[PDB]
Design an enzyme around this catalytic site. Sequence first.
Site, PDB file in Angstrom:
ATOM      1  N   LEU A  77      -1.351  10.915  13.754  1.00 48.23           N
ATOM      2  CA  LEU A  77      -1.032   9.591  14.106  1.00 48.23           C
ATOM      3  C   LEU A  77      -0.069   9.565  15.301  1.00 48.23           C
ATOM      4  O   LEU A  77       0.198   8.519  15.830  1.00 48.23           O
ATOM      5  CB  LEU A  77      -0.407   8.755  12.868  1.00 48.23           C
ATOM      6  CG  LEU A  77      -0.798   8.632  11.697  1.00 48.23           C
ATOM      7  CD1 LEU A  77       0.201   8.121  10.650  1.00 48.23           C
ATOM      8  CD2 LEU A  77      -2.316   8.000  11.560  1.00 48.23           C
ATOM      9  N   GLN A 111       3.582   1.741   2.840  1.00 42.86           N
ATOM     10  CA  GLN A 111       3.470   0.626   3.800  1.00 42.86           C
ATOM     11  C   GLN A 111       3.794  -0.928   3.410  1.00 42.86           C
ATOM     12  O   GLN A 111       3.561  -1.127   2.150  1.00 42.86           O
ATOM     13  CB  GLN A 111       1.974   0.399   4.198  1.00 42.86           C
ATOM     14  CG  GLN A 111       1.441  -0.510   5.253  1.00 42.86           C
ATOM     15  CD  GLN A 111      -0.068  -0.347   5.774  1.00 42.86           C
ATOM     16  OE1 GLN A 111      -0.701   0.369   5.114  1.00 42.86           O
ATOM     17  NE2 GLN A 111      -0.232  -1.398   6.504  1.00 42.86           N
ATOM     18  N   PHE A 121       5.476   1.716   8.171  1.00 40.22           N
ATOM     19  CA  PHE A 121       5.147   2.659   7.198  1.00 40.22           C
ATOM     20  C   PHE A 121       6.310   3.498   7.148  1.00 40.22           C
ATOM     21  O   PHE A 121       7.007   3.717   8.288  1.00 40.22           O
ATOM     22  CB  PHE A 121       3.606   3.164   7.086  1.00 40.22           C
ATOM     23  CG  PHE A 121       3.556   4.055   8.186  1.00 40.22           C
ATOM     24  CD1 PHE A 121       3.168   3.413   9.705  1.00 40.22           C
ATOM     25  CD2 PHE A 121       3.562   5.587   8.490  1.00 40.22           C
ATOM     26  CE1 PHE A 121       2.565   4.094  10.639  1.00 40.22           C
ATOM     27  CE2 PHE A 121       3.063   5.795   9.640  1.00 40.22           C
ATOM     28  CZ  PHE A 121       2.793   5.470  10.708  1.00 40.22           C
ATOM     29  N   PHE A 170       1.886  10.515   1.458  1.00 40.19           N
ATOM     30  CA  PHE A 170       1.274  10.185   2.733  1.00 40.19           C
ATOM     31  C   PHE A 170       2.408   9.202   3.292  1.00 40.19           C
ATOM     32  O   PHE A 170       3.248   9.560   3.897  1.00 40.19           O
ATOM     33  CB  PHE A 170      -0.047   9.647   2.756  1.00 40.19           C
ATOM     34  CG  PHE A 170      -0.434   8.905   3.955  1.00 40.19           C
ATOM     35  CD1 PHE A 170      -0.166   9.424   5.251  1.00 40.19           C
ATOM     36  CD2 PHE A 170      -1.470   7.898   3.725  1.00 40.19           C
ATOM     37  CE1 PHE A 170      -0.671   8.785   6.436  1.00 40.19           C
ATOM     38  CE2 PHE A 170      -1.829   7.316   4.995  1.00 40.19           C
ATOM     39  CZ  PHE A 170      -1.357   7.772   6.150  1.00 40.19           C
ATOM     40  N   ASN A 183      -0.580  -0.733  12.827  1.00 39.65           N
ATOM     41  CA  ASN A 183      -1.223  -1.507  13.871  1.00 39.65           C
ATOM     42  C   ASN A 183      -2.883  -1.817  13.713  1.00 39.65           C
ATOM     43  O   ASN A 183      -3.541  -1.298  12.703  1.00 39.65           O
ATOM     44  CB  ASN A 183      -1.220  -1.039  15.282  1.00 39.65           C
ATOM     45  CG  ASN A 183      -1.649   0.257  15.475  1.00 39.65           C
ATOM     46  OD1 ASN A 183      -0.988   1.424  16.312  1.00 39.65           O
ATOM     47  ND2 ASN A 183      -2.815   0.832  15.136  1.00 39.65           N
ATOM     48  N   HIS A 230       0.345   5.611  16.895  1.00 39.35           N
ATOM     49  CA  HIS A 230       1.491   4.669  16.367  1.00 39.35           C
ATOM     50  C   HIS A 230       2.986   4.900  16.807  1.00 39.35           C
ATOM     51  O   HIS A 230       3.322   6.197  17.094  1.00 39.35           O
ATOM     52  CB  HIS A 230       1.683   4.995  14.542  1.00 39.35           C
ATOM     53  CG  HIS A 230       0.292   4.663  14.042  1.00 39.35           C
ATOM     54  ND1 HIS A 230       0.072   3.297  13.491  1.00 39.35           N
ATOM     55  CD2 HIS A 230      -1.032   5.171  14.088  1.00 39.35           C
ATOM     56  CE1 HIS A 230      -1.395   3.305  13.264  1.00 39.35           C
ATOM     57  NE2 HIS A 230      -1.969   4.445  13.473  1.00 39.35           N
ATOM     58  N   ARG A 256       0.731  -1.306   0.144  1.00 42.71           N
ATOM     59  CA  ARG A 256      -0.033  -0.188   0.084  1.00 42.71           C
ATOM     60  C   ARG A 256       0.807   1.092   0.080  1.00 42.71           C
ATOM     61  O   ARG A 256       1.611   1.491   0.907  1.00 42.71           O
ATOM     62  CB  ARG A 256      -0.854  -0.088   1.179  1.00 42.71           C
ATOM     63  CG  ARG A 256      -1.964   0.972   1.363  1.00 42.71           C
ATOM     64  CD  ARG A 256      -2.861   0.753   2.599  1.00 42.71           C
ATOM     65  NE  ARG A 256      -3.731   1.902   2.793  1.00 42.71           N
ATOM     66  CZ  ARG A 256      -3.468   2.642   4.036  1.00 42.71           C
ATOM     67  NH1 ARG A 256      -2.575   2.691   4.800  1.00 42.71           N
ATOM     68  NH2 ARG A 256      -4.379   3.749   4.044  1.00 42.71           N
TER      69      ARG A 256
END
Lengths: 11, 165
Positions: B122, B63, B113, B60, B102, B126, B55
Site C-alpha cells: 500500500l 477499517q 484504517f 491485515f 481511498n 495510501h 470492515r
Amino acid sequence: XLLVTAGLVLA
Amino acid sequence: MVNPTVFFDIAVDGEPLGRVSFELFADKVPKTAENFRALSTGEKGFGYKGSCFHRIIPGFMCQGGDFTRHNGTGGKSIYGEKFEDENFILKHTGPGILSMANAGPNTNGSQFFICTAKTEWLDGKHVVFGKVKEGMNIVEAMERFGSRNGKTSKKITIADCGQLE
C-alpha cells in the site's frame, strides 16, 4: 486481494 | 509545538471495550492530520463519534470512518467531500500504523484504517498519517470480531472520541 478502498472492494 | 494526540473509546455491541490513543504526524502531513483531528472532536458539526468499523480482516487491518453511510461508500473530509494525497513520505511499516482509505489518487474523505501488520503493497498509494500510541491491545481485541471477508460478528463502534493533547 488485500486493499482498502471506499465503494468497490477489490480482490 | 507538539503532534496532537486523539483517542477513541471502542464498544462492542454497546459494551465498552477500551480506549486507543493515536499520535497524528502533523509535522509531516499537517492537512491530513488536521482532518482526522477535527473529525475526532466533532468541531465542524460532524465526525467519528458513534460510527462503526465496518470492515475488519484479521492479520491485515481494521477499517472505519464512514459516518454517513456506515458501509464503506460514504464519509467526507473537513475540506469538502474529498482532498488530495498530501505526500507519501511515511510507509506502512508494521502494526499500529494509521492510514487513509481511498478510491484512487486524490480521493481522501474520512475513512481510514489501522494496520495490524506491515502492509508494504500500500506504500505510495495510501497516505500514512499517524500511529497507535497506547491501546494496541484493544485493536488486537477488535480483530477477534473480524473475518476473512471483512464482515464483523459484532457491531464495533466508536462510543466516544476527542483530543487529549
